Amino acid sequence: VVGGTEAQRNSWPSQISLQYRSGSSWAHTCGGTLIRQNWVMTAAHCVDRELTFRVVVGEHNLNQNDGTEQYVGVQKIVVHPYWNTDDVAAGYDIALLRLAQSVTLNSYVQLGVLPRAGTILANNSPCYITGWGLTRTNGQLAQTLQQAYLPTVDYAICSSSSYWGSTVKNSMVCAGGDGVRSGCQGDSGGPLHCLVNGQYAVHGVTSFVSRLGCNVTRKPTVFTRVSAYISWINNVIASN
Ligand code: NA
């Protein structure tokens, strides 16, 4: 997250860190949202590589013991069957991860609330992106979980020629684009939390930023629209 602030430890208890095994270590690669005690929602592109993945729930500082983490292996990966890694602009950038164990819920570990199917936010709706991604274009991962205020940019604006044009689809949510605050590499797969009738819900799964940079004016961060995928999500969990 570029232009973020450090999240309070218990603000976003559904955020997870998706990590891969790297030598004798683990490396953060993406975010995710805990949606059942044994299921995480992330971006399909995050699991393109044939790596050993683990999820960390209750994570705050990637580099320090928080005293709240639970570490769990990924047992099964179900990518949207329409995802094409050579075509992120087509959409379908969503995957579900079945965890090897069910995690224990507490003020640091909670299920993310998903929107009702078909919900579309009004332009300029209040949302926060969260994650440990780069804090500058071509920078480094954050140590502590970051949040940035990124209001939505509706489809009609976001798909206009000076924004993303044809690249954005109605199956996506755009947010931000102010040239200061944005998602960045390593935030992919995590949540966009939007405040609706008093409750935050996870409306987005972070998908992409511009090839030119993370915080680029009129290139808002682009997210998979969760409310387009409720039936898919429910079908995968029920059949797995
Ligand atoms: Na930690």
UniProtKB/Swiss-Prot annotation:
Gene3D superfamilies per the UniProt record, alphabetical: Trypsin-like serine proteases
Cellular localisation: Secreted
PROSITE patterns the UniProt entry points to: TRYPSIN_DOM, TRYPSIN_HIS, TRYPSIN_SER
Span of domain Peptidase S1: 1-238
First-listed, main subcellular location of the protein, grouped into a coarse class: secreted
Cofactor requirements of the protein: Ca(2+)
Spans through the membrane: none
EC code: 3.4.21.36
Domain of life of the native organism: Eukaryota
Active site, renumbered: 45, 93, 188
Keyword Cytoplasm in record: no
Entry's cofactor comment: Binds 1 Ca(2+) ion per subunit.
PANTHER family: CHYMOTRYPSIN-LIKE ELASTASE FAMILY MEMBER, CHYMOTRYPSIN-LIKE ELASTASE FAMILY MEMBER 1
Protein family: Belongs to the peptidase S1 family. Elastase subfamily.
Name this polypeptide is given: Chymotrypsin-like elastase family member 1
Organism listed in the record: Sus scrofa (Pig)
Lineage, opening ranks: Eukaryota, Metazoa, Chordata, Craniata, Vertebrata
